[PDB]
Write a protein that binds this ligand. Structure first.
Ligand SMILES: [Mg+2]
Ligand SMILES: [Mg+2]
Lengths: 724, 724
């Protein structure tokens, strides 16, 4: 509908209708839900919600199916005075029913098109089941693998996160101006604004603190990239940002998000985040939480009742302008209009059952393809991998038969539909003997069984990993290790005399030195999703060639954290020419380097790269064009991730030793040679200064081209002169 | 001498004289040195120092004795055109020749007079050997025990650190306006400005980043207290402060230190820190490092040559004003004048050998008394301790005979004069059987020997600990544990069936859970210094009753770091009533609490405290007066540390759940009752807001009175109304 009619709606709503429009509730709080209806009465009484509230609520979170949505929307539209339909939002993080790899695994793909496809299939299925918005992409920069929510991020680099974040928004939304027409696409919600990943000591919900300059340099750019790409919603964070809970942080939400970033869509709170500003100690009670969160521009309160019980009295008393409420209501109505809800409240589902679009073979192949792009081969000593299909496999460990391979933040996917590692391997390999063990125990009886299977077979596939419940939200581990029984298993297996490949399933970096050292090969599968066992079997057999690279550093030990590639030099850097000396930046007990670094991953192929002649000088404002020729010099087709880093050698702020500023994943047949070109615009040479200006300073830069943050050639370019 | 004569010297100096005045050198680079002459020739040539340089240098760093100083000062005044004497500075951190407990241990004293006395004895001795300045106190806030320099701080609380920092300054300097007269006192130098202890991942020299608000709230207050108390010098930090190395950080040093804190004394670089701004990537060469460090107001370059080689040219070219150089030279001369050097360049020694004042028995008693104030009794199950004098002791482990008990940052104290554990115990206990073991090994032969000693004796004193080289500067450990052999030893000893006291020597918080669980008693002696074994023997025997309290949190595990008592609440605090829920701030694998908290320590006595009726309301600006009556209800004389904390319940910034605002250590005979009073001024209720204003907000505060951050009675005070 026309914008005039939208605005007219706001004019016609009562104060109570406008207040309720800013409330989001679980489906079973509404009449006409088809699930959990025995929870309805108790919870409504406990939250003190009336019919007047639920019949005028703005939104539903977490509908259970198309039938829930239709049931609820239908009943809601019977009683709603002005006919303003509900918007339905959902947690579609890395797939709906077809589960794709966890986001941190998709980071390791270094593949924008993989991420777009994942988001596209996700939207196709989610919209089929009646959802209009997804709480994705998660764009929090992560440097602390203790935090369980690292599995939701694409990792430690703000550029990679920015690029994959745009890819995701594109896949979910397509052309954002046509979400009223394109009913298999859905709105995206950027989260969590801001800097939630910097939680102190990796403890869930814990304090975040950094300078404003560091906030702008590293923690804000991916949110911004996604917002500029057209993300329809933004979600507040649970953490403080410089002492003020994000949800009621007026500078953050009005000045930065709506002002500098020009965001004009719905700002939704995280779950209970409005009420929880009380717990943080920055509102005395629900009246203050309401006032402060509305002053900060939060339009939609997720499943708490500060707005509903408090806004009327704040507005009647003069403590809050009713204009702020109108602006909130207008953004809610505009989202709904963007989604086409005023013309079709069922968004394409009424008399059009799309059950058929969910969990198709094509979608499944897309998830397998995403898993084989995202896995990272970490060790492969002596061409153990790929295994011949006649290789006799002892498959042992807790991940041998476990169905827990879909990952965390899997709200709708079912383990019954997933492929476990044994099933996967039995499709490819004729001889497999299986010995499952428990995640946290290694019995005498287990060791006898393991010894017997290994003795029978020729190679060991040792499948280890985390339960998905050990990460995700409020899955903080102080010590980033598997259960000790797993490391003891890897040590035991090593003693049996046969080659060992460890296939590792997990949602965070872990201490894997003891694994690498106890095996011949190590393949990091993360959690690949629905097609996990086929992903594993294809990579092991070489049907697919590993091509992922780490998007997050793997520390030597828990106490190295935070460790990350884009770090400052310090006044006393360790150099090859001072190593051994006391008075340099080092630890007494471990290396400075992480166990594996950013951008690292192996392949069954071998590649040679060469960079075309670059200029020695550049003007201010001028781009550097970087041409790279890459040849596959082996007999095995595969993919390499070309990476380009820049360094600012001297600056008015100490700058990182490297920052990723371009990447492309190149597929090459045996012998095949391609040339790829990168433009590093003057923005790539710029940074935030002490006064928080975005600046380019004349001076020396290094340019690094290669295949990890360590395997690079280096070139120097002197920036100066006049500005273009 | 008169100020007009000081100003006149500046007017008369050549530019080359002025530039060299801003240089500090090791003693052996001066003619007249009486040690390390063999080092002089090569080092002069590598630094490209000539006689016009050394005969005009401003200061000496680390003279080895009174004779070195005299020889150096005599030779230099033969050749110095204008007669400007050298100022001699040294590292007197917790004692000169009589070594007191390490600063972290003095923090655990919670005793201002103990710290004052340590600094007084240190000055008595240091001045007797010809030093004019000490590079103490170290006032860096510490929350990360990986960092080896925690041993130099008084811990994680800015209030405690503030109070003991003032006590040290008062102890070294006395009345600072009479340093030309009181030649047994010396100038103090606050260090390291600023925020060096926040080194990321506890890695030496590594990145520091925090919000400006946090910097003011927690990281600057102790430096400020010591500056306000009259500290003569300040030293720059090695780390970046919001991206800019502190040494050339103009905002920090000009605006904050000289402007806001009104510091008008010498700003000395840390070692090489002027040249190292190059390494940090914020100066291209020595010419820029010099410019920027002089613009930031650094007056004295410690052992690098940026100033001496580049200033003349920067001044001649007009890139740098000669006025900044004159200001530096004037501060350097004012310092020398404050020390009386223009009337007596030898500061009391030239006709007065004060060898007599060094390592006196009186001073050794003060060091013992400081050790028994500072140890912390952590466990004492079944009144194992105190031991009777006739107890038959098996003394075993790496600390049974090690002479390494004087601590890190012991530049001048000698182990031959210290008292090891065996020696201390044999002065008190008639029956001691000793079995020494290595710091990092536990052999079969050791076990046989330990088992035999234990079989013969009735109790085990298991003496464990760190080598001092495992901490201090560039002594970072990624895992805060002793060598695994020591934990294996404690496990072994526990099997022998006799009661065990572990006496632990160390410079940082360690993971001690396994030690607490493997023993009946645990006594944290840190490194007590010269009288270490006597301190140990008195506490074990009850001649002294332990009275120390932790000034830094002891983590459950390395991965809990940072953990500290003055933390924010978060949006989802763990409460005793949401125990067991997933969606709260917690770890899956450990408690949120540290193993032991701030302000905890045991005693051989028992106390009861009672707080007198407090007001329910208070005006803004008004003090709260807190009166507490304490009684020793045991038969044993003892000291208890009464602590008072404040919490700001609701604020415009999320405030810590507690902060210490008053403490007093109270000595009580058996059955003795005392009353003490505390004034919490309105400044105790104040904090820095979003705009960096120091404010007091009306509202609810809680007041906590007790004997730890956990063992408290709580009271509520509503603050508002008018301002008083
Ligand atoms: Mg530059
Ligand atoms: Mg308050």
């Amino acid at each position: 509908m026309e914008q005039e009619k939208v605005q007219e709606l706001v004019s016609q709503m009562t104060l109570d209708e406008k207040i309720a429009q800013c409330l989001q509730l679980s489906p079973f709080l509404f009449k006409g839900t088809n699930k959990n209806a025995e929870l309805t009465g108790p919870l409504l009484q406990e939250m003190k919600l009336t019919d007047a509230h639920t019949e005028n609520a703005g939104s539903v979170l977490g509908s259970s199916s198309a039938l829930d949505m239709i049931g609820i929307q239908e009943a809601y539209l019977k009683t709603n005075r002005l006919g303003i339909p509900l918007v339905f939002m959902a947690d579609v993080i890395h797939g709906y029913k077809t589960v794709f790899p966890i986001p941190l695994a998709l980071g390791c793909s270094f593949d924008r098109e993989t991420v777009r496809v994942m988001a596209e299939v996700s939207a196709l299925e989610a919209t089929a089941d009646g959802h209009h918005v997804t709480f994705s992409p998660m764009l929090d920069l992560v440097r602390d693998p203790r935090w369980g929510r690292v599995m939701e991020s694409t990792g430690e680099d703000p550029f990679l996160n920015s690029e994959l974040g745009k890819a995701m928004v594109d896949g979910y939304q397509g052309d954002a101006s046509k979400l009223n027409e394109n009913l298999e696409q859905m709105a995206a919600c950027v989260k969590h604004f801001a800097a939630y990943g910097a939680a102190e000591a990796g403890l869930e919900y814990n304090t975040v603190n950094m300078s404003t300059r560091e906030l702008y340099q590293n923690y804000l750019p991916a949110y911004n990239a996604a917002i500029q790409a057209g993300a329809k919603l933004v979600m507040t964070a649970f953490n403080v940002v410089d002492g003020i809970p994000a949800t009621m942080n007026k500078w953050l939400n009005r000045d930065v998000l709506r002002g500098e970033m020009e965001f004009d869509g719905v700002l939704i709170s995280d779950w209970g985040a409005v009420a929880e500003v009380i717990n943080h100690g920055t509102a005395r009670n629900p009246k203050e939480a309401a006032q402060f969160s509305m002053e900060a521009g939060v339009d939609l309160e997720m499943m708490t009742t500060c707005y509903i019980h408090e806004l009327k009295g704040l507005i009647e008393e003069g403590k809050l302008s009713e204009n702020l409420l109108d602006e909130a209501v207008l953004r809610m109505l505009n989202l709904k209009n963007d989604l086409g809800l005023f013309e079709d409240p069922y968004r394409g589902l009424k008399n059009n059952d799309r059950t058929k679009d969910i969990l198709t073979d094509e979608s499944r192949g897309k998830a397998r393809a995403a898993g084989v792009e995202s896995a990272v081969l970490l060790e492969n000593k002596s061409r153990l991998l790929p295994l011949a299909k006649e290789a006799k496999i002892a498959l042992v460990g807790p991940l041998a038969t476990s169905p827990d391979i879909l990952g965390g933040w899997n709200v709708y996917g079912e383990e019954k539909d997933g492929i476990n590692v044994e099933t996967g391997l039995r499709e490819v390999f004729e001889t497999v003997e299986v010995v499952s063990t428990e995640y946290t125990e290694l019995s005498e009886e287990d060791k006898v069984a393991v010894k017997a299977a290994v003795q029978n077979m020729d190679v060991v596939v040792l499948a280890l990993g985390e339960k998905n419940e050990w990460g995700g939200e409020a899955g903080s581990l102080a010590t980033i290790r598997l259960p000790e029984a797993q490391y003891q298993l890897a040590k035991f297996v090593q003693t049996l005399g046969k080659p060992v490949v460890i296939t590792l399933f997990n949602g965070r970096p872990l201490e894997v030195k003891e694994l690498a050292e106890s095996s011949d090969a190590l393949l990091e599968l993360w959690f690949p999703g629905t097609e996990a066992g086929r992903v594993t079997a294809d990579l092991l057999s070489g049907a697919s060639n590993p091509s992922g690279k780490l998007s997050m550093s793997f520390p030597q030990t828990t106490g190295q954290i935070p460790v990350y590639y884009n770090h400052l030099r310090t006044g006393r850097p360790q150099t090859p020419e001072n190593k051994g000396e006391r008075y340099v930046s080092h630890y007494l007990d471990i290396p400075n380097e992480p166990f594996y670094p950013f951008g690292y991953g192996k392949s069954y192929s071998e590649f040679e790269l060469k960079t075309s002649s670059l200029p020695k000088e550049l003007n201010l404002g001028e781009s550097l064009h970087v041409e790279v020729t890459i040849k596959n010099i082996s007999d095995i087709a595969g993919k390499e991730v070309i990476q380009v880093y820049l360094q600012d050698v001297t600056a008015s702020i100490s700058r990182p030793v490297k920052e990723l500023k371009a990447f492309e994943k190149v597929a090459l047949q045996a012998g095949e040679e391609k040339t790829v070109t990168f433009e590093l615009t003057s923005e790539a040479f710029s940074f935030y200064n002490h006064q928080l200006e975005k600046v380019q300073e004349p001076g020396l830069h290094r340019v690094f081209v290669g295949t990890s943050s360590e395997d690079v050639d280096v070139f120097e370019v002197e920036v100066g002169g006049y500005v273009l």
